Design an enzyme around this catalytic site. Structure first.
Site, PDB file in Angstrom:
ATOM      1  N   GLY A   1       8.554 -20.762 -21.522  1.00 18.16           N
ATOM      2  CA  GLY A   1       7.890 -21.591 -20.519  1.00 18.16           C
ATOM      3  C   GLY A   1       7.485 -20.819 -19.281  1.00 18.16           C
ATOM      4  O   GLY A   1       7.084 -19.654 -19.368  1.00 18.16           O
TER       5      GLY A   1
ATOM      6  N   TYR B   1       9.324 -19.610 -16.843  1.00 12.43           N
ATOM      7  CA  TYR B   1      10.081 -18.373 -16.974  1.00 12.43           C
ATOM      8  C   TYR B   1      11.333 -18.582 -17.807  1.00 12.43           C
ATOM      9  O   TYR B   1      11.795 -19.711 -17.995  1.00 12.43           O
ATOM     10  CB  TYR B   1      10.409 -17.737 -15.616  1.00 12.43           C
ATOM     11  N   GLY B   2      11.860 -17.479 -18.317  1.00 15.95           N
ATOM     12  CA  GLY B   2      12.981 -17.501 -19.240  1.00 15.95           C
ATOM     13  C   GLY B   2      12.579 -17.816 -20.666  1.00 15.95           C
ATOM     14  O   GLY B   2      11.403 -18.055 -20.965  1.00 15.95           O
TER      15      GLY B   2
ATOM     16  N   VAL C   1      13.622 -20.161 -24.164  1.00 18.77           N
ATOM     17  CA  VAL C   1      14.347 -21.325 -24.658  1.00 18.77           C
ATOM     18  C   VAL C   1      14.743 -21.133 -26.122  1.00 18.77           C
ATOM     19  O   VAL C   1      13.923 -20.734 -26.947  1.00 18.77           O
ATOM     20  CB  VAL C   1      13.543 -22.630 -24.473  1.00 18.77           C
TER      21      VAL C   1
ATOM     22  N   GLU D   1      19.398 -31.242 -23.004  1.00 25.65           N
ATOM     23  CA  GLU D   1      19.291 -32.048 -24.223  1.00 25.65           C
ATOM     24  C   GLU D   1      18.168 -31.480 -25.101  1.00 25.65           C
ATOM     25  O   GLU D   1      17.123 -31.081 -24.593  1.00 25.65           O
ATOM     26  CB  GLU D   1      19.022 -33.522 -23.902  1.00 25.65           C
TER      27      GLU D   1
ATOM     28  N   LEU E   1      15.123 -31.713 -27.671  1.00 30.58           N
ATOM     29  CA  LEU E   1      14.100 -32.578 -28.239  1.00 30.58           C
ATOM     30  C   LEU E   1      13.447 -31.864 -29.415  1.00 30.58           C
ATOM     31  O   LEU E   1      13.528 -30.642 -29.510  1.00 30.58           O
ATOM     32  CB  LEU E   1      13.094 -33.018 -27.173  1.00 30.58           C
TER      33      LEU E   1
ATOM     34  N   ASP F   1       7.036 -30.781 -29.411  1.00 28.64           N
ATOM     35  CA  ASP F   1       6.153 -31.070 -28.276  1.00 28.64           C
ATOM     36  C   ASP F   1       4.951 -31.904 -28.711  1.00 28.64           C
ATOM     37  O   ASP F   1       4.628 -31.955 -29.896  1.00 28.64           O
ATOM     38  CB  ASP F   1       5.745 -29.802 -27.499  1.00 28.64           C
TER      39      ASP F   1
ATOM     40  N   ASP G   1       2.588 -29.465 -13.594  1.00 30.30           N
ATOM     41  CA  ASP G   1       2.273 -28.745 -14.827  1.00 30.30           C
ATOM     42  C   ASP G   1       2.318 -29.643 -16.053  1.00 30.30           C
ATOM     43  O   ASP G   1       2.821 -29.249 -17.109  1.00 30.30           O
ATOM     44  CB  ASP G   1       3.190 -27.527 -15.012  1.00 30.30           C
TER      45      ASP G   1
ATOM     46  N   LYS H   1       1.031 -31.076 -19.274  1.00 33.27           N
ATOM     47  CA  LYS H   1       0.162 -30.665 -20.369  1.00 33.27           C
ATOM     48  C   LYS H   1       0.949 -30.976 -21.631  1.00 33.27           C
ATOM     49  O   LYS H   1       2.178 -31.085 -21.566  1.00 33.27           O
ATOM     50  CB  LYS H   1      -0.182 -29.167 -20.291  1.00 33.27           C
TER      51      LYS H   1
HETATM   52  N1  LIG Z   1       7.095 -26.245 -30.492  1.00 36.08           N
HETATM   53  S1  LIG Z   1       7.857 -27.214 -31.206  1.00 36.08           S
HETATM   54  O1  LIG Z   1       6.988 -28.262 -31.378  1.00 36.08           O
HETATM   55  O2  LIG Z   1       8.156 -26.633 -32.415  1.00 36.08           O
HETATM   56  C1  LIG Z   1       9.110 -27.574 -30.334  1.00 36.08           C
HETATM   57  C2  LIG Z   1       9.001 -27.649 -28.960  1.00 36.08           C
HETATM   58  C3  LIG Z   1      10.074 -27.953 -28.163  1.00 36.08           C
HETATM   59  C4  LIG Z   1      11.288 -28.190 -28.723  1.00 36.08           C
HETATM   60  N2  LIG Z   1      12.370 -28.505 -28.029  1.00 36.08           N
HETATM   61  C5  LIG Z   1      12.643 -28.349 -26.748  1.00 36.08           C
HETATM   62  N3  LIG Z   1      11.962 -27.499 -25.998  1.00 36.08           N
HETATM   63  C6  LIG Z   1      12.209 -27.324 -24.726  1.00 36.08           C
HETATM   64  O3  LIG Z   1      11.508 -26.449 -24.021  1.00 36.08           O
HETATM   65  C7  LIG Z   1      10.782 -25.516 -24.730  1.00 36.08           C
HETATM   66  C8  LIG Z   1       9.616 -25.027 -23.938  1.00 36.08           C
HETATM   67  C9  LIG Z   1       8.637 -24.325 -24.830  1.00 36.08           C
HETATM   68  C10 LIG Z   1       7.614 -23.639 -23.961  1.00 36.08           C
HETATM   69  C11 LIG Z   1       6.966 -24.603 -22.982  1.00 36.08           C
HETATM   70  C12 LIG Z   1       7.963 -25.521 -22.309  1.00 36.08           C
HETATM   71  C13 LIG Z   1       8.882 -26.158 -23.295  1.00 36.08           C
HETATM   72  C14 LIG Z   1      13.195 -28.037 -24.156  1.00 36.08           C
HETATM   73  N4  LIG Z   1      13.738 -28.144 -22.985  1.00 36.08           N
HETATM   74  C15 LIG Z   1      14.681 -29.048 -23.060  1.00 36.08           C
HETATM   75  N5  LIG Z   1      14.787 -29.546 -24.277  1.00 36.08           N
HETATM   76  C16 LIG Z   1      13.897 -28.943 -25.003  1.00 36.08           C
HETATM   77  N6  LIG Z   1      13.610 -29.080 -26.273  1.00 36.08           N
HETATM   78  C17 LIG Z   1      11.404 -28.134 -30.085  1.00 36.08           C
HETATM   79  C18 LIG Z   1      10.333 -27.815 -30.884  1.00 36.08           C
END
Ligand SMILES: NS(=O)(=O)c1ccc(Nc2nc(OCC3CCCCC3)c3nc[nH]c3n2)cc1
Lengths: 257, 294
Positions: free
Chosen positions: B14, B16-17, B19, B78, B80, B83, B124, B126
């Site tokens: 994202g 920064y950092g 995930v 948590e 999820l 997206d 942000d 989107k």
């Molecule tokens: N791409 S994907 O569709 O395969 C998919 C997407 C996101 C997640 N899960 C998920 N992601 C996070 O940030 C991930 C981050 C990705 C870069 C942009 C910002 C969001 C989270 N932050 C708290 N909980 C979170 N859970 C699972 C599968």
């Protein structure tokens, strides 16, 4: 506009939770009200040099009082706590915060970059990352919307008085930001225009001149004694045309409350 | 601290950092781990953590823990499942059912109203930052670009918002922007959920403005008082006529069109708030179904 009431209510809740411990200075073995006053005055200088928001100054002071509410600090380390807090406040609030190197420079090289960075970490740990604290400034800008009509000198004078309250822990530590802002706005309004705390703000805040009086009596005295106070950086700052030279204004002799 | 977590896989990167998907070994809880390698602690992390600890809402990604280990900062969220962007791509040939679009929009507006009521700008919004689960929730994520605002607002950072979802007042360089910029982004996302293509896919600020103008008309002083005075306004701007709003997002019926037009109002003062949008007739039959896929 659609969120002003919600936000004000929320900030009134948070100022209670984000409040420093009133009697902490008595529990500190090595530091005094006087030492803290010197620290805050120096932070004012720092803010002036780097053109920092007034909000940044108010946040840094809140971080310091909260840190010192639980952490004993030797006099030789007080400025380090102050420096890390102002760094943190800048990162939270400023569009363009000064770099760490700039914070090392203004400490007369008393401390290293590594010390400043470790103290940042500790401050964040001790405050458990809770940095979005309400300030006198945040309540003032809301109270300013109740002027009829708007007056730049009242605004700057209110900010000037609110800033002076930062210097003296006795007695301002016992007052909430919303109450100090209330007194400061009333005092500025009365000094410039002769007007008083408006009905529309009683409606908003629940505060009257009666509930504001204790803080107002203290702030009145601080205003009267300001040119004779040991710390002068705020008076110097508020001579500038940016704040309409309001520190040149004469305080009223009486408030007639 | 990190002992009880088993990493599963990388999710992405994202503001920064990094995930990671991970699992709590003692409780079984699946979590998302934001890893920050440590100029000191970044302002983006300082803002994200402080704001997320205050924001406790069903449609805002929940910060669970903050772990200060040796050299690294770990944020536990948590988990999820997907997206919104990947979900829209999976809907390429079937589309997204109206009840789901409606439910997602309603939830996002709730999430946004809560943010704004707690003096927070997201800045942000989107599809990549909007996260869905198997039970039908949608949640705001990546608060790295967020900030706490004042009343009234000061001038804040002028960089803000990914170009495609960036409000006119940012593109035209107004001294002040506020909660309305998040609403603009959501309006673009509403259109996108329906057509499954970006509403204004520009690649420069000028290209972005012109795409917006060709859809909503070039703003004049009548529709947006003060516009001709704004820093980045040019009198040479082509003056495009405002087209039939039913042609902007054709599948949308009267209530949806009405809501979208209020979200995409030029004047930030006239643009609908998230709070007021919750009561729009569009949502009179709103429910919360599970995603129709996966
Ligand atoms: N791409 S994907 O569709 O395969 C998919 C997407 C996101 C997640 N899960 C998920 N992601 C996070 O940030 C991930 C981050 C990705 C870069 C942009 C910002 C969001 C989270 N932050 C708290 N909980 C979170 N859970 C699972 C599968």
């Amino acid at each position: 506009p659609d969120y002003h009431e919600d936000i004000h209510t929320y900030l009134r809740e948070m100022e209670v939770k984000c409040k420093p411990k009133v009697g902490y200075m008595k529990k500190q073995p090595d530091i005094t009200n006087s030492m803290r006053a010197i620290l805050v005055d120096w932070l004012v200088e720092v803010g002036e040099e780097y053109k920092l928001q007034n909000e940044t100054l108010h946040l840094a002071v809140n971080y310091i009082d909260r840190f010192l509410s639980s952490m004993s600090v030797l006099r030789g380390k007080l400025q380090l706590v102050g420096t890390a807090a102002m760094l943190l406040a800048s990162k939270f609030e400023e569009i363009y915060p000064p770099e760490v190197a700039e914070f090392v420079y203004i400490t007369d090289d008393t401390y290293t970059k590594k010390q400043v960075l470790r103290m940042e970490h500790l401050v964040l740990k001790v405050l458990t990352f809770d940095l979005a604290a309400p300030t006198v400034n945040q309540f003032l800008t809301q109270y300013f919307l109740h002027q009829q009509p708007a007056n730049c000198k009242v605004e700057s004078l209110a900010m000037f008085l609110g800033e002076l309250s930062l210097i003296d822990a006795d007695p301002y530590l016992k007052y909430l930001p919303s109450v100090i802002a209330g007194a400061a706005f009333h005092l500025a309004l009365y000094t410039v225009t002769g007007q008083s705390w408006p009905e529309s703000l009683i409606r908003k805040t629940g505060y009257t001149l009666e509930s504001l009086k204790p803080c107002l009596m203290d702030l009145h005295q601080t205003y009267l004694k300001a040119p004779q106070h040991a710390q002068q950086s705020i008076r110097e700052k508020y001579k500038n045309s940016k704040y309409h030279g309001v520190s040149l204004l004469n305080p009223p002799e009486t408030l007639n409350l | 601290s990190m002992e009880n977590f088993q990493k599963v896989e990388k999710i992405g990167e994202g503001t920064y950092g990094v995930v990671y998907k991970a699992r709590n070994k003692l409780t079984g809880e699946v979590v998302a781990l934001k890893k920050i390698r440590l100029e000191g602690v970044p302002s983006t992390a300082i803002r994200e953590i402080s704001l997320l600890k205050e924001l406790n809402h069903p449609n805002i990604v929940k910060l669970l823990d903050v772990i200060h280990t040796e050299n690294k900062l770990y944020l536990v969220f948590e988990f999820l499942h997907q997206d919104l962007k990947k979900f829209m791509d999976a809907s390429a040939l079937t589309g997204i059912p109206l009840p789901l679009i409606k439910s997602y929009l309603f939830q996002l507006l709730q999430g946004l109203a809560f943010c704004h009521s707690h003096r927070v700008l997201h800045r942000d919004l989107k599809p990549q930052n909007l996260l869905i689960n198997t039970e039908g929730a949608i949640k705001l994520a990546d608060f790295g670009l967020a900030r706490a605002f004042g009343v009234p607002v000061r001038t804040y950072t002028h960089e803000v918002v990914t170009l495609w979802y960036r409000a006119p007042e940012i593109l035209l360089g107004c001294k002040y922007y506020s909660t309305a910029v998040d609403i603009w982004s959501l309006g673009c996302i509403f259109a996108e959920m329906v057509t499954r293509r970006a509403l204004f896919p520009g690649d420069s600020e000028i290209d972005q403005l012109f795409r917006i103008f060709r859809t909503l008309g070039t703003p004049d002083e009548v529709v947006w008082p003060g516009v001709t005075s704004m820093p980045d306004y040019k009198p040479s701007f082509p003056k495009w006529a405002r087209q039939d709003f039913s042609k902007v997002v054709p599948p949308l019926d009267e209530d949806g069109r009405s809501l979208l037009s209020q979200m995409l109002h030029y004047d930030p003062n006239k643009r609908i708030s998230a709070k007021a949008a919750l009561a729009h007739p569009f949502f009179q039959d709103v429910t919360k179904p599970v995603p129709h896929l996966r």
